[PDB]
Amino acid sequence: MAVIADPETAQGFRLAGLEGYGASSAEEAQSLLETLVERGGYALVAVDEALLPDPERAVERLMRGRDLPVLLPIAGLKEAFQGHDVEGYMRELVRKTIGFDIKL
Amino acid sequence: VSPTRMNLLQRRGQLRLAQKGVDLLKKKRDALVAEFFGLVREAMEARKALDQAAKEAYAALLLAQAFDGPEVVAGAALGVPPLEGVEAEVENVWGSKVPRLKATFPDGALLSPVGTPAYTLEASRAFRRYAEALIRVANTETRLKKIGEEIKKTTRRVNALEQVVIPGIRAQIRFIQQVLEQREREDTFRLKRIKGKIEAREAEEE
Amino acid sequence: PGGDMSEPVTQSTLRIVGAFWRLDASLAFRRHFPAINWNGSYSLFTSALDPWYRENVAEDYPELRDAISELLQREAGLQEIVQLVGPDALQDAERLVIEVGRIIREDFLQQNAYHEVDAYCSMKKAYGIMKMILAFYKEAEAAIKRGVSIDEILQLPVLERIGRARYVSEEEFPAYFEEAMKEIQGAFKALA
Amino acid sequence: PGGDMSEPVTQSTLRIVGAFWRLDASLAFRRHFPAINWNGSYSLFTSALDPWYRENVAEDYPELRDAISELLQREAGLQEIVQLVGPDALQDAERLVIEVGRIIREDFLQQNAYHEVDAYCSMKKAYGIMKMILAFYKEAEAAIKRGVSIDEILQLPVLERIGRARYVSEEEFPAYFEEAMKEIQGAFKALA
Amino acid sequence: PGGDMSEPVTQSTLRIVGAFWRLDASLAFRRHFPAINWNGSYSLFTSALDPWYRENVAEDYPELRDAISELLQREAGLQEIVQLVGPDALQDAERLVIEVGRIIREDFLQQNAYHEVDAYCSMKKAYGIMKMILAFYKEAEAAIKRGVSIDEILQLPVLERIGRARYVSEEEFPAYFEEAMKEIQGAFKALA
Amino acid sequence: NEIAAQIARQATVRPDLSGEGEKEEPFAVVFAAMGITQRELSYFIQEFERTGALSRSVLFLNKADDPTIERILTPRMALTVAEYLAFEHDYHVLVILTDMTNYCEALREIGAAREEIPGRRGYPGYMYTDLATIYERAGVVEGKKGSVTQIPILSMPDD
Amino acid sequence: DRTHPIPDLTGYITEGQIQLSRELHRKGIYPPIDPLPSLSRLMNNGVGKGKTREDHKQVSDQLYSAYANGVDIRKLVAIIGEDALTENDRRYLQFADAFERFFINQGQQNRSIEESLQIAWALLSMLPQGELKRISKDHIGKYYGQKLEEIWGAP
Amino acid sequence: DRTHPIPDLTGYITEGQIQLSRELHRKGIYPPIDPLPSLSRLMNNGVGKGKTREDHKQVSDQLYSAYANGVDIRKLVAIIGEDALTENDRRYLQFADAFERFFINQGQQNRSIEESLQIAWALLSMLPQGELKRISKDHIGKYYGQKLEEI
């Protein structure tokens, strides 16, 4: 599969049977993931939230008709120490998927 | 619609059907919402499990390339083959199909069962758990988003009903009612007029 | 006038006649005859005739007629859900009822008046046709109970026999019926 | 005939009367008495009656009444989400306004006609109860802004007290009101 | 009387006149004048006049007219769809149709009766305006086909040129029209 | 009106398909106009003289500026002539009655001037019998060759 | 049509109605009396202790609410399916079916009031105790738990 | 009912009408005058250069066309979510609500024509240029100055 992350971890994912790369620029990332999905030989991808928070504003325009390669955000090198805020992401997802701010 | 009595009764039937359909859709939405709030909790729990399992692989990869060899890891990564057994299972959730990841992902079947480096060995076992937890998060969040889509779809349908069809049918109904009342009033005025006219004429001939 | 069932003459008639056969403009536009609106019609003689039927047609005729009427009522009930959610959203336990409604409506009730063999229809013929329709229904329901998808049920080749039923002559019909019955049994026991 | 306010007699009546108290059946279904719906009802004598209130009850009575009315309006303008999601998943200020709407329509509007004390109420009793509820709502809002949760606030010992003001006699109400306002102020310092 | 077209005077007039210019209140509530409902109106003279247009306006005037009318008809059709699902739930072709429809009915059909210039409009002027609108439509369609999104189409500078075309006087309109064709061509040609 | 004129211009029997009869003599058009306007009348006359069918057509014109109560007689005169031609000189006749709505207007007017009991929307109570005395004057007769074919045209008021 | 002048004025003057239904009739149920739109306006004064058994009123109310719930759930299961319903909802479904098959469809029998209350309690027992929210606890302890026996083994 | 014979026949004789809305009354607005179904036929003879300020007629026109869009955008927001928007649909909802809450709901006070036009320009300013394609370019350069922070 694939992952658009810091290449320093991408080599670990290589060790994990999963090719990965990146160049710490949103533009080149969203440019060559176009090719990546046109070369859609993988079932899913991962991307750091920093390179882009939402991969849909990148790939949905080409992810029409297909749904197999699923895209989801993953934490990065910076967050690996400080940690992630699951609640921020979950709440910003539920707010749109149900139309209200919930669970306070 | 032509204004008659048959049409009026049909429009009333339609209005009753629409209301009894609105409440049914609302109940379907309530069940969907129960399922959704049941899913979101386990989804955030699986995300927390992924977060914690990230620290293990992170710790393994930091001191591996640092304390142990910096290039042995690159050599081994180029050595071990990648994964193409990542087939995905189809799943239907509330009348619609979603993918379900069922990546083969062998464990001992790959290269170097027990090998030379001390940290490159245990690290390779850590990205195993990393990938496993990640695909678990994938499988739960995809269904979560699907259920959310169905909920907003049902909401859109309910609002469409309750603010476009019901008022339109009420307006049609009242227009037909006015037409029918008007015609009845005209004909009774005409009857009274002819009755009085012939009665005046007969009182004239007595 | 204007097809209005609320005129005074139709109302005067409603309270006098013993049976009432209602024509509808929709089925008439579709060229689907006899175009008798099943929902609005009725008959008040169906009880006092049961002895004649049990003695002259078949011992269990009233029960078959009652089963068919209950099926049609259930289908008419489901139509109000279809009309707002669409036919492809129902559970297959319900698409079965809708499809059997369609089969009944277009293979039993609909009748050709100009065909030299479907113009007239005996009563034991109708008995046979009802019998095998509801036999197939019961079997296919038992099937869906075993995880059979609804679509392949709607492709079994015996449906063509059931559709051709009403064009068989009155003296050929018993052989056709005794063949179709075992064929319907086999269309499910053989798949196992 | 069947509850349609558009019929000629109701339309002719609504052009001359000054108040329209709307009894309702759904309210009586959930044991809310007297079943006057505060949403359809209306009155046209208030604007002319303000001075009698300002002189014979209090100088701020119209303001308290406007506050209670706006509070009920907010509460009712929120029923869609609470029916979609349920109360216990709302935010802080929304759950606060929901619970205050409940306190209102369960300790102020509701009245037991068979009880030997609540059957009748003065104007000053109503003014006192409204002032109590407004004080509590102000304190609860400030506290939730400060950092307390709602579950503590709904367990305050003064909720049962403000919910008991319906049943105190007219002679023993004024001192009751004074000490109750004292306690409402009191629990606040615990919230800060 | 009620704006109702089934009243006897209207129904008696519709049997003898050649054209029926129907006014609408909905168009007048949003200040769209002359507020004529182009869906309900018709004219039975339009065919006998073509030998006149072909010699006195332009040889291809009827083609322009028929294309404009067909565009209006399509946008009227699909706006019923867009009413329930919003404009984002439909593809780029329908978006272009909707935008060109808004352009047509806000830059061609409207006519300020109190403006010192717009109050009167010749035939050559109307031909030129229709020609501009159709030229832009064809170009934008080819463009959206070859990979430009809708936003850069809507942010073009030539739309302000087409929009103010009706305020240009008669004796100087031809030069404005030539320049406008230049710009409609050049805003897409420099746009690859 | 265009559909009616097109039918009149193109209509023909096909005896090579029935096999019987090989004559194919054209129709003789009887055309009755009640309350017709100048526009529609001009269209009809020009179409007929284009197709060359005036030499075998009878016309009873009652324009919209003619008196109203005349329209009580136009259909009956037209159908008298049609029946005569068909069942006496073996013609195949095609009758086109251009607007029955105007006939009903005239009927209602003369009926309400006389103060009867009116029917559904003021129209008289005998309108059914009155229209039947016009429509039922058509068909084919045993032992004769002629035929009378009717194509009434009416305008449903509010569709 | 319940707006025709005859039933309209009869509703003005009388105290309620018993609505017959075509659906129960065609489904083979007799007498096809439809409990949801029917209503007796003077019922409260003629039931209770000293007149009938003392549980009469609450039993009738619980039956009414449970039937309405079961009917709506039967409509919902067609689009959702019985595997996606809660347990209490499946109970309500089965209750509604047994209700319109045993309580309503009585045939040409002559039931007394005590047998009617027997059948009512046997039906209410299909639901879980604690869902019976209109009946008081004493009546529950006194009559709940009875099972359908006389209705299938006896006529 | 606007089609009842009384308001209907009265509509054909007068030179306009001021129609009151029950919705604005429910919202607490006063005077609950909803501007879409209202009309004043003789307006153009009384306003304009040398009678009122110069921008009167065009301000009215643009204000009307802008508020008319807000009503229908707010209508479709009531069916699909409020998520489906752009930068400008936010603008139009905000303008419509600020209109109903500041321009109409004036209370019992007496506003001159100058401060009325001032409020109107302050309410139009919360739309960008370019959308105000009903007014000309000159007095918008003149009057776009104040924003609604004056209350």
**Interchain proximity E18–F39, CB inside 8 Å:** yes
Q: In this structure, what token pair is assigned to residue F28?
A: 């003789």
Is the bond preceding H31 in cis, omega lying within 30 degrees of 0?
Answer: yes
Report the distance separating Cα G53 and Cα H14, nearest Å.
72
Report the distance separating Cα C64 and Cα C134, nearest Å.
8
**Interchain proximity A102–D92, CB inside 8 Å:** no
CB-based burial label for D146 (10 Å; 0-12, 13-18, 19+): exposed
Report the distance separating Cα F63 and Cα D124, nearest Å.
85
**The domain containing residue B196 runs over which residues?**
1-206
**Interchain proximity H79–B164, CB inside 8 Å:** yes
Contact yes or no for F37/F99 (Cβ under 8 A): no
Q: In the 8-state DSSP scheme, what is residue G128?
A: P
Report the distance separating Cα B104 and Cα B123, nearest Å.
20
Report the distance separating Cα C46 and Cα D101, nearest Å.
60
Instruction: Find all residues with CB under 8 Å of F85, minimum gap 6, and list them.
Output: F28, F30, F91, F93, F146
Expressed in Å, this structure's resolution amounts to 3.1
Contact yes or no for A98/B36 (Cβ under 8 A): yes
Contact yes or no for G74/C91 (Cβ under 8 A): no
- Check if B108 contacts C (Cβ < 8 Å): no
The amino acid present at B18, given as its one-letter code, is: A
- Check if F67 contacts E (Cβ < 8 Å): no
Burial profile H114-150: b = 16 or more Cβ within 10 angstroms, e = fewer: eeebbbbbbbbbebeeebbeebeeeebeebeeeeeee
Cα distance from D14 to chain G (closest Cα, Å)?
22
Chain C 5-34, residues with CB within 8 Å of chain B CB atoms: 5-6
Q: In this structure, what token pair is assigned to residue D182?
A: 């004292």
Instruction: Find all residues with CB under 8 Å of G108, minimum gap 6, and list them.
Output: none
Residue whose C-alpha is closest to residue H115's, from H129, H103, H126: H103
**Interchain proximity B142–A42, CB inside 8 Å:** no
| Nearest residue of A to residue B77, measured between CA atoms | A15
Report the distance separating Cα E85 and Cα C158, nearest Å.
44
Task: Name the domain count of chain B.
Answer: 1
Backbone φ, ψ for residue D11 (5° rounding): -65, -40
Size of interface B-E (CB pairs under 8 A): 5
Q: In the 8-state DSSP scheme, what is residue H31?
A: S
Chain A 20-49, residues with CB within 8 Å of chain B CB atoms: 41-44, 46
Q: Which residues of C touch G81 (CB under 8 A)?
A: 91, 93
Give me the DSSP letters along F109-152: HHHHTTT--B-TTS-BTTHHHHHHHHHTS-B--TT---EEEE--
Report the distance separating Cα E97 and Cα E141, nearest Å.
9
Q: Which residues of D touch G8 (CB under 8 A)?
A: 1
A90 closest CB neighbour out of B33, B44, B155? B44
**Interchain proximity C6–B6, CB inside 8 Å:** yes
The strand pairing partners of B99, in sequence order, are B90
- Check if B116 contacts C (Cβ < 8 Å): no
- Check if A104 contacts B (Cβ < 8 Å): no
Residue whose C-alpha is closest to residue H39's, from E26, E110, E35, E28: E28
| Nearest residue of C to residue G29, measured between CA atoms | C70
Q: In this structure, what token pair is assigned to residue G1?
A: 């049509």
Report the distance separating Cα E125 and Cα E174, nearest Å.
8
Give me the DSSP letters along C72-134: HHHHHHHHHHHHHH-GGGS-HHHHHHHHHHHHHIIIII---SSSTTTSS--HHHHHHHHHHHH
Q: Which residues of B touch D85 (CB under 8 A)?
A: 33
**Interchain proximity E11–F101, CB inside 8 Å:** no
| Nearest residue of B to residue D85, measured between CA atoms | B33
Report the distance separating Cα D77 and Cα D75, nearest Å.
6
Q: Which residues of E touch B156 (CB under 8 A)?
A: 84-85
**Interchain proximity B5–C4, CB inside 8 Å:** yes
**Interchain proximity H8–E163, CB inside 8 Å:** no
The amino acid present at A10, given as its one-letter code, is: A
Cα distance from B152 to chain D (closest Cα, Å)?
12
Cα distance from C158 to chain B (closest Cα, Å)?
29
Report the distance separating Cα F19 and Cα E43, nearest Å.
47
Instruction: Find all residues with CB under 8 Å of A40, minimum gap 6, and list them.
Output: A66, A68, A69
Give me the DSSP letters along E122-148: -HHHHHHHHHHHHHHHHHHHHHHHTT-
Please count the other Cβ atoms lying within 10 Å of the Cβ belonging to residue D172: 10
**The domain containing residue A70 runs over which residues?**
1-100
- Check if D2 contacts B (Cβ < 8 Å): no
**Rg of chain A in Å (alpha carbons):** 15
Chain C 66-85, residues with CB within 8 Å of chain B CB atoms: 80-81, 83-84
Report the distance separating Cα F69 and Cα A31, nearest Å.
84
Task: Name the domain count of chain A.
Answer: 1
Please count the other Cβ atoms lying within 10 Å of the Cβ belonging to residue B96: 12
| H/E element, G40 | strand G39-40
Query: What count of residues does chain E have?
Result: 192
Report the distance separating Cα A97 and Cα A91, nearest Å.
10
Contact yes or no for A90/B43 (Cβ under 8 A): yes
Cα distance from G44 to chain C (closest Cα, Å)?
34
| Nearest residue of B to residue G2, measured between CA atoms | B9
| Nearest residue of F to residue E17, measured between CA atoms | F37
Separation of CA G28 from chain center:
18
Q: Which residues of H touch E4 (CB under 8 A)?
A: 3
* Touch test E–B: 3 Cβ pairs or more under 8 Å: yes
Residue whose C-alpha is closest to residue H77's, from B163, E93, B168: B163
CA distances to B55, C52, C60, C122, C134 from C65, rounded to whole Å, are: 72, 14, 9, 15, 10
| Nearest residue of A to residue D91, measured between CA atoms | A104
* Touch test G–E: 3 Cβ pairs or more under 8 Å: no
> Which chains does A contact via 3+ CB–CB distances below 8 A?
B, D, H
Separation of CA G68 from chain center:
9
The strand pairing partners of D19, in sequence order, are D43
Q: Which residues of D touch G12 (CB under 8 A)?
A: 1
Q: In the 8-state DSSP scheme, what is residue D23?
A: B
Instruction: Provide the CB-side half-sphere exposure for G97 (13 A, CA).
Output: 8
Report the distance separating Cα D67 and Cα D130, nearest Å.
9
Cα distance from B20 to chain A (closest Cα, Å)?
24
Report the distance separating Cα E35 and Cα E31, nearest Å.
8
**Interchain proximity E2–H3, CB inside 8 Å:** yes
Which of A90, A98, A102 should be substituted to probe chain D, the one whose Cβ sees the most D Cβ atoms within 10 Å?
A102
**Interchain proximity H65–E31, CB inside 8 Å:** yes
Report the distance separating Cα H21 and Cα B65, nearest Å.
75
The amino acid present at A33, given as its one-letter code, is: L
Report the distance separating Cα G48 and Cα A85, nearest Å.
62
Report the distance separating Cα A70 and Cα A63, nearest Å.
9
The amino acid present at C50, given as its one-letter code, is: D
